């Protein structure tokens, strides 16, 4: 009967010289902290029960109290930064790392969960858990011939804790830690469980978010084909982190973007750029923007996959953030592409949505659209077709928009509109 205990009763039971009374009070505190409607985490912390739970973590001859205190500390460290800090101050990190090697599977899983929460608090606690040496037993827990023999929740919690170990920047995870975790991450990226796949993709996206050296560290393991395969999956919790990782990779060197292209990622984008989920569309358009900022052969590969009509459609009707990413994509396309590629972009119907988006209040998208229009005008000048494209701009009402932008607030906006009017509309 350890249900709905009072904090006073829990303190009275824990402070007793009875190990069984201590276990009963600890299970009561666990059931109290596992409740959904505002668990009194601060009330438990003020009572000074965290050191008692940390000490109970070490009672190897009493595994039930170990499991109960581990669950309680897990649910306490799952709260705010102050509560996780209070858990850490009690000396719980080395105790949980010691419990990682417990013969009882549930106690080891609880230690994994608690360490995952502590590392997910932030970068400082993540690096502190790494310094305490959790990576070695965490990876030893997965040194099995087939991951299918492990329990589902066990594998999921281990994958989530590993992902939290790769999470957060400023500072980024240590290079040695990332290199140690990466093979197990590549192995988890091929498991059949959807949650494990989603968390592994989240970890890969965390690792690829930063300098190109980290992106190369991830790419050298050859996970890009599997990343594209998971990008083609049907479960949105799997597609989202896969798309994030693909974008983070295409933010690097042109060789990494070419590695992404070689895996066949562009074939998935016809559905990604028309995904009913707004965030998926926005992230796909951002990835496309960074791909259009690459070499001319990469732009030609974008063209070959018929993604220019999809970019036009996203520019015409989508979320405003998706439309901003599309404008960035068109600007990168026109600035990096050949004159024939810009002519093809015009033939796909880019001028009408490019003009219709000039009525937005965001200044940055206005500058982006003006730069794109400028680049198309330079292409037409190289082709001697300035008059026809000027007629095109004037027919859809874009000339009126540029003339109204001539008297705009931002310096770049009005200087651009004036340049374009005086150079191609006189």
């Amino acid at each position: 009967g350890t249900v709905n205990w009072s904090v006073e009763d829990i303190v009275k039971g824990i402070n007793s010289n009875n190990l069984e009374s201590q276990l009963q009070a600890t299970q009561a505190a666990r059931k109290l902290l596992s409740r959904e409607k505002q668990p009194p985490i601060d009330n438990i912390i003020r009572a000074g029960l965290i050191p008692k739970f940390v000490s109970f973590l070490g009672k190897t001859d009493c595994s039930p109290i170990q499991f109960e205190s581990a669950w309680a500390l897990t649910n306490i460290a799952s709260g705010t930064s102050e509560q996780t800090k209070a858990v850490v101050d009690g000396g719980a990190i080395p105790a949980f790392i010691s419990l990682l090697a417990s013969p009882h599977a549930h106690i080891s899983e609880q230690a994994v969960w608690a360490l995952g929460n502590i590392a997910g608090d932030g970068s400082a606690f993540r690096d502190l858990v790494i310094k305490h040496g959790a990576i070695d037993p965490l990876l030893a827990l997965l040194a099995v011939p087939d991951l299918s023999t492990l329990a589902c929740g066990y594998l999921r919690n281990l994958t989530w804790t590993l992902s939290n170990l790769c999470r957060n920047k400023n500072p980024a995870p240590p290079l040695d830690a990332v290199e140690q975790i990466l093979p197990t991450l590549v192995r988890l990226l091929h498991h059949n469980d959807p949650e494990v796949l989603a968390d592994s993709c989240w970890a890969i996206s965390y690792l690829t978010d930063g300098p190109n050296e980290r992106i190369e560290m991830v790419v050298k393991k050859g996970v890009v084909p599997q990343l594209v395969k998971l990008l083609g999956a049907t479960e949105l919790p799997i597609v989202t982190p896969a798309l994030r990782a693909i974008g983070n990779i295409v933010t690097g060197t042109d060789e990494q973007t070419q590695k992404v292209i070689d895996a066949g990622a562009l074939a998935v984008f016809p559905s990604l750029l028309t995904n009913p989920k707004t965030n998926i569309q926005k992230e796909a358009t951002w990835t496309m923007s960074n791909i259009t900022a690459g070499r001319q052969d990469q732009i030609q590969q974008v063209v070959n996959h018929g993604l220019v009509p999809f970019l036009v459609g996203v520019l015409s009707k989508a979320d405003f953030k998706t439309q901003k990413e599309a404008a960035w994509a068109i600007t990168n396309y026109t600035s990096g592409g050949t004159v024939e590629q810009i002519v093809y972009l015009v033939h796909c119907g880019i001028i009408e949505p490019l003009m219709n988006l000039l009525s937005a209040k965001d200044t940055k998208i206005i500058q982006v659209i003006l730069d794109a229009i400028s680049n198309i005008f330079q292409a037409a000048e190289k082709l001697g077709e300035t008059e026809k494209l000027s007629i095109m701009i004037e027919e859809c009402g874009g000339l009126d928009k540029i003339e109204a932008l001539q008297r705009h607030e931002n310096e770049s906006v009005y200087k651009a509109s004036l340049n374009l009017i005086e150079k191609y509309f006189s």
Binding site: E36, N75, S78
Partner: peptide
Amino acid sequence: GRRKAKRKKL
């Protein structure tokens, strides 16, 4: 140019 947690056991 290119452009660039905690769970509770219930």
